[PDB]
Amino acid sequence: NFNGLTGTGVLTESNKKFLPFQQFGRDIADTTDAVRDPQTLEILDITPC
Amino acid sequence: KIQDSLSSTPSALGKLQDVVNHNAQALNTLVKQLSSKFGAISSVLNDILSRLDPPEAEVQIDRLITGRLQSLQTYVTQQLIRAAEIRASANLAATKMSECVLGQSKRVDFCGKGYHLMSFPQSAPHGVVFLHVTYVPAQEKNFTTA
Amino acid sequence: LSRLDPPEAEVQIDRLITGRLQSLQTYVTQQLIRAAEIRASANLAATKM
Amino acid sequence: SFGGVSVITPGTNTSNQVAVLYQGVNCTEVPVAIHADQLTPTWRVYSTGSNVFQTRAGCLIGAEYVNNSYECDIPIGAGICASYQTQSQSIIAYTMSLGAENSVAYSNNSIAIPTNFTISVTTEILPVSMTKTSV
Amino acid sequence: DCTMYICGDSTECSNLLLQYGSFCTQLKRALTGIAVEQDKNTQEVFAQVKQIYKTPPIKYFGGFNFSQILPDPSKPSKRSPIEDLLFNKVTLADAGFIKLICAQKFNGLTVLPPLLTDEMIAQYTSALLAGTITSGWTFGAGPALQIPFPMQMAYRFNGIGVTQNVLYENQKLIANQFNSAIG
Amino acid sequence: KQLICAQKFNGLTVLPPLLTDEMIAQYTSALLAGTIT
Amino acid sequence: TQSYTNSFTRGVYYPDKVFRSSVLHSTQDLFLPFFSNVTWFHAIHVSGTNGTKRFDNPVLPFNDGVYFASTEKSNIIRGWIFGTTLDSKTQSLLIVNNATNVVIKVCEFQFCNDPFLDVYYHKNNKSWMESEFRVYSSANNCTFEYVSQPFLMDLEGKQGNFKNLREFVFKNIDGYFKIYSKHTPINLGRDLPQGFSALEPLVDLPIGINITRFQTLLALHRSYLTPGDSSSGWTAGAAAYYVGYLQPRTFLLKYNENGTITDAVDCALDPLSETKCTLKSFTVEKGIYQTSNFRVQPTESIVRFPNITNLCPFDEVFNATRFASVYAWNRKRISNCVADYSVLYNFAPFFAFKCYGVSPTKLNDLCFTN
Ligand SMILES: *[C@@H]1O[C@H](CO)[C@@H](O[C@@H]2O[C@H](CO)[C@@H](O)[C@H](O)[C@H]2NC(C)=O)[C@H](O)[C@H]1NC(C)=O
Ligand SMILES: *[C@@H]1O[C@H](CO)[C@@H](O[C@@H]2O[C@H](CO)[C@@H](O)[C@H](O)[C@H]2NC(C)=O)[C@H](O)[C@H]1NC(C)=O
Ligand SMILES: *[C@@H]1O[C@H](CO)[C@@H](O[C@@H]2O[C@H](CO)[C@@H](O)[C@H](O)[C@H]2NC(C)=O)[C@H](O)[C@H]1NC(C)=O
Ligand SMILES: *[C@@H]1O[C@H](CO)[C@@H](O)[C@H](O)[C@H]1NC(C)=O
Ligand SMILES: *[C@@H]1O[C@H](CO)[C@@H](O)[C@H](O)[C@H]1NC(C)=O
Ligand SMILES: *[C@@H]1O[C@H](CO)[C@@H](O)[C@H](O)[C@H]1NC(C)=O
Ligand SMILES: *[C@@H]1O[C@H](CO)[C@@H](O)[C@H](O)[C@H]1NC(C)=O
Ligand SMILES: *[C@@H]1O[C@H](CO)[C@@H](O)[C@H](O)[C@H]1NC(C)=O
Ligand SMILES: *[C@@H]1O[C@H](CO)[C@@H](O)[C@H](O)[C@H]1NC(C)=O
Ligand SMILES: *[C@@H]1O[C@H](CO)[C@@H](O)[C@H](O)[C@H]1NC(C)=O
Ligand SMILES: *[C@@H]1O[C@H](CO)[C@@H](O)[C@H](O)[C@H]1NC(C)=O
Ligand SMILES: *[C@@H]1O[C@H](CO)[C@@H](O)[C@H](O)[C@H]1NC(C)=O
């Protein structure tokens, strides 16, 4: 129930290096793969079921 | 010289590579077709439900359903024709392996350029490779005949 | 365009694009089969030659 | 007025020159006398620049015609091709060559009989199956 | 052409059409593949000779008359009379050419011209005919090998279980029968 | 299997062939031995 | 001092706030076209004993966003002015900077004649110059303000040969103002160095209005590096003040594995480039490709209508004393007149006006028979 994502997955953590002011992670086929943390300012990692 | 010729020229196996390349491209296009609005408010279901009330939100998403069905139909429609042509090629290969390998062939220019002697098959990914051994006259000399 | 305002012109114009796409698809669909027939005939002709 | 536009280019790993083919258009008209703020494509720098040849399949701009006979690389149509080689390098558009000319000798009291052979091994590649899938 | 056929050069129609995704990148690829295949077919069928042969100027093959299939130099195009009849008996609608209903195709429908001109195909056929009447079937193995036509015909008879003396004893009759049959 | 191949989780899978390469190799070896001996 | 120079590969920014890596992505947005002229506008006003009239603040059109580039030390140029007429009867914008602040407002600013200059204009002996002010003459009717963190900050460079070129691109659309900026260092010897750089979003602001000019507020109180010449007609000089114009082009960016854009290609510059855009790859193999179609654009429009003088009597029908019964409705004919359908709203305060076959908005552009 995020701020405009409403995703569903097994999100654990992103180890990738992200640009400071970017939130949405994307792939070749344009699917969400990263979520900013509103509190800890940490990039999450969307992963399907 | 077969090994060296195959290792030098990389375009010899151009018939086998297209088989996987076309399928990969078709699957990629089918996946990419999802990110299309199809003449609707949005291309994502969650937002279109969360932004509108049921009575016209249900109407809006029917366009997505019909567009996705139309996109899915063409894939199998093309796959049927591709499978048919692959079956034709497989039947031709089976005939070649049953005629040239298991005997001698008298058909002109069927199992190789020239006169046919033998044939040895080899296995390749999603295909088969033959090695025809032929006979060719070399040195000419004319005469007078009656 | 010159007789209906855009709010309903978009609705009216969408009923022609779908029909024209459906009419255009059948042409290439049938040509893809005629091409296979012609290719089979060409292979037979090459073998006969 | 409208028509198809095609780009004839060698491999970008080799050179950086291109040629433009206007499909099925008599290029005595506007296509040879193009003007700014008049054509759909944003690029009009080529214009004519000489080296304009008329083909039965359209008009070719940017390739100089030479009358020779080579085995052509890039097909165009109506017995015309193009290739990127020498006449300093540029793009030429010659006429396709079917093969080397040869004349046979025939007589009613002569016959040719071979005296030696040669064993050769060729190859043949045929697909047998394609990758399965499910949805 | 999708854009011109579906939309009459209208910006709004193009903008709404762009929302359907790649429903015309595919339709601009199948036709190109078909055109490539049709260009390859005529090369696969006819282009079977490494070089181009020519019949000798003196034409006497033991009574066999081949004037109805060899090229005719009198005509502007080197085509045999049978080929002339076949060309006349078939009428094409538009071909490629250069530019009553063919002009009503302002709606993005065009026709590309074939790669091989009819003269090149005629030259291929002439080379094949010269090879098959001068050198017999030996030109399909390697280079052409000379042999007189009557002996080739006797050998073809020998290949079907008929003793080769039959032709030499009945050469004139067979030549006349062939001349009447081809005429 | 557990980038595009793992991305096709929308329902587009690829089934494996019934015959592994080590059996087609056995077929080819048997054919070669038969046609040589 | 006006001169023209070619911008090679500058004027590109992040299309959106979204991360993306190790792919090729296509965007359609207002960008700076590749290989376009950029003008150099220079200021010449120094020395106190001797000098000449400056007139060194030209007015720029600001045609739907501009690209700004300038090389200075810390604060030689400050602020940017928008508006449409820049007078007492019209609204004007006052986006200006400060030491550690930014001032942004729109108002009916009347007069901005000349910034406060001490006429000394000599920093070679005394470099004490501060608080010139004279931002505006007066404010009439306005309250909006944007006191916040300053947009531009100075960078420290030691040992020489570290100069930073400042790239500011402004987006004034849909009633909102968007600024994308980034500092490009290593401006050692090349005025417009070849390479590639990326800009980043800063802030948005709902301004609106119909801004149609640009004005510069370069601080001429203490100026330096001021060559002078009569160069004109696509020449070379030195201005340290670059301005560009944005066109609606389409580019195909190449995101790296770290998410930073490395290479960008124009899709409407070169047929080779257009082919690259069509194939969605940076390498194209030898062959022939069918890319697009060409059409001839129109020249002008012509309207041909029949000439009728008298007006249509819609008042006789709507403003009538008596109407007949429903079972004996009377049919009236209107012909041979010019009809205005935007006036029938005044005759009566009706609002049903349910109209079936034609939209009421565009009834004035169709010709009927009766
Ligand atoms: C038929 O061809 C073979 C191969 O070209 C000839 O054998 C060659 O003979 C020469 C000289 O005698 C040698 O230098 C080569 O090394 C031989 N080649 C091989 C592969 O051994 C053979 O002589 C020819 N036949 C006749 C009658 O000349
Ligand atoms: C081979 O056949 C052709 C035609 O079948 C012969 O040409 C004809 O000759 C007769 C008399 O010589 C003429 O009346 C015809 O008009 C000719 N027709 C054509 C099409 O040329 C030709 O003479 C025959 N060859 C030989 C050696 O007799
Ligand atoms: C028909 O009658 C109406 C109402 O009696 C008139 O309506 C006026 O229209 C003018 C047009 O600009 C307005 O300025 C007035 O405010 C309207 N008044 C009212 C009370 O509605 C209308 O003018 C009459 N038609 C004519 C031709 O005079
Ligand atoms: C054999 O052919 C050559 C060249 O084709 C020729 O010079 C020679 O005379 C021919 N032999 C005979 C016996 O005619
Ligand atoms: C092309 O146009 C020229 C000039 O109008 C004309 O002479 C010619 O017949 C036309 N057709 C061609 C060259 O096929
Ligand atoms: C053919 O080539 C010759 C020799 O280069 C040249 O003089 C002539 O102009 C050419 N003809 C054409 C039609 O290009
Ligand atoms: C071979 O043909 C020539 C050409 O007419 C002829 O003169 C000669 O007699 C023929 N040979 C024989 C053995 O008849
Ligand atoms: C599946 O489980 C086996 C057994 O532990 C393991 O060896 C293999 O790596 C697993 N496959 C994965 C993790 O893709
Ligand atoms: C840019 O400068 C060149 C140099 O002469 C000039 O021809 C051109 O008109 C200018 N403008 C554009 C848009 O290229
Ligand atoms: C600049 O900032 C200082 C400190 O915040 C402030 O006192 C001053 O008024 C500002 N200048 C303007 C013109 O607002
Ligand atoms: C503009 O400001 C003046 C006072 O400076 C005020 O009287 C006037 O009403 C304002 N304009 C509008 C449209 O309110
Ligand atoms: C991406 O970041 C890594 C980590 O420092 C670096 O090694 C690599 O060179 C970067 N890729 C570039 C700069 O293209």
Author numbering:
A (entry chain D): 542 to 590
B (entry chain A): 933 to 1078
C (entry chain B): 981 to 1029
D (entry chain A): 591 to 677, 689 to 736
E (entry chain B): 737 to 835, 849 to 932
F (entry chain A): 835 to 836, 849 to 883
G (entry chain A): 25 to 394
Paper text:
Owing to multiple mutations to the spike protein, including in the receptor-binding domain (RBD) and N-terminal domain, Omicron BA.1 infection can result in substantial NAb evasion. The Omicron variants that have emerged more recently contain similar RBD sequences to BA.2, with the addition of L452 and F486 substitutions—L452Q in BA.2.12.1, L452M in BA.2.13 and L452R/F486V in BA.4 and BA.5—and exhibit a transmission advantage over BA. We expressed and purified the prefusion-stabilized trimeric ectodomains of BA.1, BA.2, BA.3, BA.2.12.1, BA.2.13 and BA.4/BA.5 spike (S-trimer). We determined the cryo-electron microscopy (cryo-EM) structures of these S-trimers at overall resolutions of 3.1–3.5 Å.
Compared with the RBD of BA.1, BA.2 contains three additional mutations, T376A, D405N and R408S, and lacks the BA.1 mutations G446S and G496S. All the S-trimers contain Gly-Ser-Ala-Ser (GSAS) and 6P mutations along with the T4 fibritin trimerization domain for increased stability. Of note, one RBD in BA.2.13 was clearly disordered, representing a stochastic movement, which, together with BA.2 and BA.2.12.1, suggests structural heterogeneity in the S-trimers of BA.2 sublineages. By contrast, BA.1, BA.3 and BA.4/BA.5 spike possess relatively tight inter-subunit organization with more buried areas between S2 subunits. In line with structural observations, thermal stability assays also verified that S-trimers from BA.2 sublineages were the least stable among these variants, which might confer an enhanced fusion efficiency. Additionally, the BA.2 subvariants displayed slightly higher binding affinities for hACE2 than the other Omicron variants. The results reveal that the lack of G496S in BA.2 sublineages meant that the hydrogen bond with hACE2 K353 was regained, increasing their binding capability, in line with experimental observations revealed by deep mutational scanning (DMS) assay. Despite this discrepancy, we conclude that BA.2 subvariants and BA.4/BA.5 are able to maintain high binding affinities for hACE2.
